[PDB]
Amino acid sequence: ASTDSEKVAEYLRRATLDLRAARQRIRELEGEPVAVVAMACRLPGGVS
Amino acid sequence: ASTDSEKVAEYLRRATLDLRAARQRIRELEGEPVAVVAMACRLPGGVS
Amino acid sequence: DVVMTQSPLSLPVTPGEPASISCRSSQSLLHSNGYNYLDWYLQKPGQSPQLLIYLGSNRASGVPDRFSGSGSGTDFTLKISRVEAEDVGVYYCMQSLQTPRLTFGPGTKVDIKRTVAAPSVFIFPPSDEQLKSGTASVVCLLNNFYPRGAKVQWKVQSGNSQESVTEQDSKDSTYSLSSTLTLSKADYEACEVTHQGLSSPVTKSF
Amino acid sequence: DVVMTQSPLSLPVTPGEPASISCRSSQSLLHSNGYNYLDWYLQKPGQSPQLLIYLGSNRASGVPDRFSGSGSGTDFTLKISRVEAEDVGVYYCMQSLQTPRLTFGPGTKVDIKRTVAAPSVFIFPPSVVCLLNNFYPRGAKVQWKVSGNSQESVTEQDSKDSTYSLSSTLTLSKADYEKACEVTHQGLSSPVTKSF
Amino acid sequence: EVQLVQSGGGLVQPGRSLRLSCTASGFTFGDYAMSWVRQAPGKGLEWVGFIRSKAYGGTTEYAASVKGRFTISRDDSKSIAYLQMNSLKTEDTAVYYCTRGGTLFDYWGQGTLVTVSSASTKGPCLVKDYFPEPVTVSWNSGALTSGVHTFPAVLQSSGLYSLSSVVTVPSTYICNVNHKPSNTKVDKKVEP
Amino acid sequence: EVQLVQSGGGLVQPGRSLRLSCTASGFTFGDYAMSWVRQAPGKGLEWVGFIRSKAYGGTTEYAASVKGRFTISRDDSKSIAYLQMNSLKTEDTAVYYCTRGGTLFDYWGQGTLVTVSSASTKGPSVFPLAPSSAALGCLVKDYFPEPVTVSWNSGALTSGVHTFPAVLQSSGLYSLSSVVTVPSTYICNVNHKPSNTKVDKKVEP
Numbered sequence: 001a002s003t004d005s006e007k008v009a010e011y012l013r014r015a016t017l018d019l020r021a022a023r024q025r026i027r028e029l030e031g032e033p034v035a036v037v038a039m040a041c042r043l044p045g046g047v048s
Numbered sequence: 049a050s051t052d053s054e055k056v057a058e059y060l061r062r063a064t065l066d067l068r069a070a071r072q073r074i075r076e077l078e079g080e081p082v083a084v085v086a087m088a089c090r091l092p093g094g095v096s
Numbered sequence: 097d098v099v100m101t102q103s104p105l106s107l108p109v110t111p112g113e114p115a116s117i118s119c120r121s122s123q124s125l126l127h128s129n130g131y132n133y134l135d136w137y138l139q140k141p142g143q144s145p146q147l148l149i150y151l152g153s154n155r156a157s158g159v160p161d162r163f164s165g166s167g168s169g170t171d172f173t174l175k176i177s178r179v180e181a182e183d184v185g186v187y188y189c190m191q192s193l194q195t196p197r198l199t200f201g202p203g204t205k206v207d208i209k210r211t212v213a214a215p216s217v218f219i220f221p222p223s224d225e226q227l228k229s230g231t232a233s234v235v236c237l238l239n240n241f242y243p244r245g246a247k248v249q250w251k252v253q254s255g256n257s258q259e260s261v262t263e264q265d266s267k268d269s270t271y272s273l274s275s276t277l278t279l280s281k282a283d284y285e286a287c288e289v290t291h292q293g294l295s296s297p298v299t300k301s302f
Numbered sequence: 303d304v305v306m307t308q309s310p311l312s313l314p315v316t317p318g319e320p321a322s323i324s325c326r327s328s329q330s331l332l333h334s335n336g337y338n339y340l341d342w343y344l345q346k347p348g349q350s351p352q353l354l355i356y357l358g359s360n361r362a363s364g365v366p367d368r369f370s371g372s373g374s375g376t377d378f379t380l381k382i383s384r385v386e387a388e389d390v391g392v393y394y395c396m397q398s399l400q401t402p403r404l405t406f407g408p409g410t411k412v413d414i415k416r417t418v419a420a421p422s423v424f425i426f427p428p429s430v431v432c433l434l435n436n437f438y439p440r441g442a443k444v445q446w447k448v449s450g451n452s453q454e455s456v457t458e459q460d461s462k463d464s465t466y467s468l469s470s471t472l473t474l475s476k477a478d479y480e481k482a483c484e485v486t487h488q489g490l491s492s493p494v495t496k497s498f
Numbered sequence: 499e500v501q502l503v504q505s506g507g508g509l510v511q512p513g514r515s516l517r518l519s520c521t522a523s524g525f526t527f528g529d530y531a532m533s534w535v536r537q538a539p540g541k542g543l544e545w546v547g548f549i550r551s552k553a554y555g556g557t558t559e560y561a562a563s564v565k566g567r568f569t570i571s572r573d574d575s576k577s578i579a580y581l582q583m584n585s586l587k588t589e590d591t592a593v594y595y596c597t598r599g600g601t602l603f604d605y606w607g608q609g610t611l612v613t614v615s616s617a618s619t620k621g622p623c624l625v626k627d628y629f630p631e632p633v634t635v636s637w638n639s640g641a642l643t644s645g646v647h648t649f650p651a652v653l654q655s656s657g658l659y660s661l662s663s664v665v666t667v668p669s670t671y672i673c674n675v676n677h678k679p680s681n682t683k684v685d686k687k688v689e690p
Numbered sequence: 691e692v693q694l695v696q697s698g699g700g701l702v703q704p705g706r707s708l709r710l711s712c713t714a715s716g717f718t719f720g721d722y723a724m725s726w727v728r729q730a731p732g733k734g735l736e737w738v739g740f741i742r743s744k745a746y747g748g749t750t751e752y753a754a755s756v757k758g759r760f761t762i763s764r765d766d767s768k769s770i771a772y773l774q775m776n777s778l779k780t781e782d783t784a785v786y787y788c789t790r791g792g793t794l795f796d797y798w799g800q801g802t803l804v805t806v807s808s809a810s811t812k813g814p815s816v817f818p819l820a821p822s823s824a825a826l827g828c829l830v831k832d833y834f835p836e837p838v839t840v841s842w843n844s845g846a847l848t849s850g851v852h853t854f855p856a857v858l859q860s861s862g863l864y865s866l867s868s869v870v871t872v873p874s875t876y877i878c879n880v881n882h883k884p885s886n887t888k889v890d891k892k893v894e895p
């Protein structure tokens with residue numbers, strides 16, 4: 001109604017959000033950090 | 049150039065293109081098929 | 097400027113194989129900028145509706161990848177891959193070029209495909225749960241008569257009754273139904289049903 | 303409606319560490335839809351220009367992930383992560399509120415950072431020239447007086463060392479000579495003169 | 499990250515007023531435009547109204563069949579939108595939804611249900627003449643759990659909904675009802 | 691994929707006429723709007739014109755110093771854009787670009803030289819010297835056109851060469867210079883294939 005930029009803005013926002021989500025998924029797939037939670041060892045010299 | 053009538057169209061087209069490219073990249077990364085090229089075997093009997 | 101078009105309203109589905117829904121509206125909706133103005137919405141039975149495909153054919157984020165869309169100047173089809181159980185629901189062809197919309201429309205309904213069936217034609221001219229106080233309104237009953245398309249009428253002639261349906265009889269997929277006629281005391285001095293599974297109409301008075 | 307980069311026009315860089323280019327504007331854009339109509343462009347030496355980021359910071363495809371824009375409607379600034387080879391050229395700030403855009407703008411140059419090595423001065427008697435050598439950072443002033451007519455040239459940023467060299471020629475025609483050449487550099491003290 | 503968590507509703511006699519609230523969360527509520535959609539029971543969908551964003555002003559379009567009956571107000575301090583029910587008239591009863599966006603309908607929030615009209619509890623196998631709203635069945639005192647065919651209620655001339663349930667066997671059956679506001683369990687057997 | 695190529699360009703005397711062809715492939719050319727930009731040889735980039743799309747119909751607007759000078763042309767059968775030339779001026783000598791988009795300048799073309807002058811191929815002069823020391827200098831003056839090659843010791847010593855780019859003389863000719871080093875038997879050689887001239891010169895201090 002208002003001029004013609006009354007519906008185009010919503011589509012622009014939707015497209016931007018989808019692009020952001022897709023790039024986030026790419027980043028998580030290819031570069032997700034991995035954390036170490038626990039560790040155990042058995043080494044000479046009486047180390048247990 | 050008509051304000052808010054043509055400028056948004058180019059941005060929408062660019063955003064759609066980028067979204068399509070990102071989704072294509074995701075699909076290719078996740079499940080791209082792999083082809084079999086050569087063949088070799090050594091089986092019991094006279095098979096060589 | 098009307099989108100009265102719709103796919104077969106009672107399209108059934110089976111798990112595993114794809115399906116297609118198409119609606120071809122009135123005068124083309126291709127804007128000057130070069131974009132169709134059609135959108136798709138899904139109403140899962142029980143909760144709030146959801147958005148599937150916005151302008152043209154572009155899957156929204158979070159929608160399963162099985163869904164896809166296609167379109168043209170006036171022809172638009174919604175193509176879905178292998179169907180699962182949860183996909184049962186209601187779908188709408190939804191346009192945005194015209195004035196702000198007044199109603200989404202009748203939409204399309206889907207269900208699990210099932211072989212044809214026949215009713216049980218149970219009638220209860222006996223009526224005592226409301227007797228000696230007022231009219232009990234009688235009741236004629238149907239059971240396991242898939243597909244859901246059926247209708248009833250009362251003759252003895254009548255023009256006032258009430259009906260209710262169930263939700264595809266759960267796993268039976270047969271849509272049991274009950275009908276209730278409306279009567280009074282002054283007229284207390286029957287139910288006829290026919291559907292494509294039933295070859296001939298049947299009526300009883302006992 | 304008037305935008306100037308206001309960023310360091312030279313901005314020497316060195317790989318490894320990141321950098322940034324500020325872009326100060328006039329009254330903010332903030333179109334009613336809720337966006338900023340500002341874009342970025344990059345020009346490689348001797349290459350066709352290419353787009354990097356359109357409105358806001360949503361860098362298009364093909365662009366490496368090391369680029370990232372940011373900023374409000376009147377304080378736009380482009381962030382670049384760890385610096386690598388190339389990326390040397392001219393960067394442009396582009397607005398979109400006024401359609402009849404005439405010139406992209408002076409732009410900001412990018413080059414490899416180096417030391418403050420002093421220049422060298424030489425003269426060539428006979429239509430004579432005054433040339434220098436290896437005077438990074440770029441810059442030199444020629445004020446031949448013994449003024450008004452001159453012609454000079456400058457090479458690229460000395461790929462192997464990044465120390466520019468310059469040559470300027472006195473504009474003369476024939477035997478009309480009947481009788482100054484000094485250069486001031488920021489990495490140099492008071493200029494020295496040969497004067498034939 | 500995005501919820502609308504609308505609330506506020508109940509039973510209202512004809513010719514009265516009420517209000518509803520939609521609560522934004524996460525996203526910048528200022529830019530978007532709110533909308534209200536009503537779904538009648540057993541029907542499709544219908545649009546009620548919407549309010550433009552501040553960038554375009556505060557224009558509100560109330561479609562039709564309302565024309566000042568209800569009003570939509572927007573608050574930005576707490577990002578809450580309000581719909582002012584006023585002078586309710588019978589058929590207005592439905593479930594109401596608050597959605598985000600003027601033309602493209604986004605995340606859509608969730609719905610709330612209101613009723614209308616005036617009556618009183620009556621108490622109820624037909625299981626007729628009740629008006630709390632819900633009714634439960636405890637077939638065979640909860641023992642028999644086969645062949646159950648409980649059917650949804652049906653509006654009548656003066657409310658006072660009625661129910662139905664049936665089982666079959668070609669061969670000890672209490673049916674029985676439960677009523678939350680009155681606890682009028684009747685049990686009883688039947689022989690035809 | 692999306693490729694844009696440009697054709698049409700060369701030496702033309704003042705007051706001539708010409709046209710430029712922009713070729714697009716790999717996308718629906720109808721929707722987009724073409725725009726032409728020009729970069730001066732040693733200056734910034736200045737917008738020239740912009741033609742709208744038939745969806746909005748419309749035409750171009752051009753700008754100052756170009757309005758009423760020459761026009762545009764755009765087709766649809768083969769998606770070939772045309773820029774006309776009318777009464778070319780010497781200051782118009784600059785590289786030209788054709789790119790997609792009217793406001794957001796997307797994927798560009800490749801460029802075309804398109805020079806304007808009124809002269810002929812000439813033979814370069816030498817006037818060399820070695821005053822005292824060391825960046826030995828053997829300049830080249832009064833040659834046309836631009837293509838020219840220089841070397842030292844018949845292309846033997848190539849360590850520290852500091853040949854400088856060309857500069858336009860006020861007479862339409864060009865002047866060069868070339869110095870390398872000698873911190874102490876050196877001959878300067880230059881070739882001008884467009885004028886097919888071989889010049890080798892020995893210089894002493």
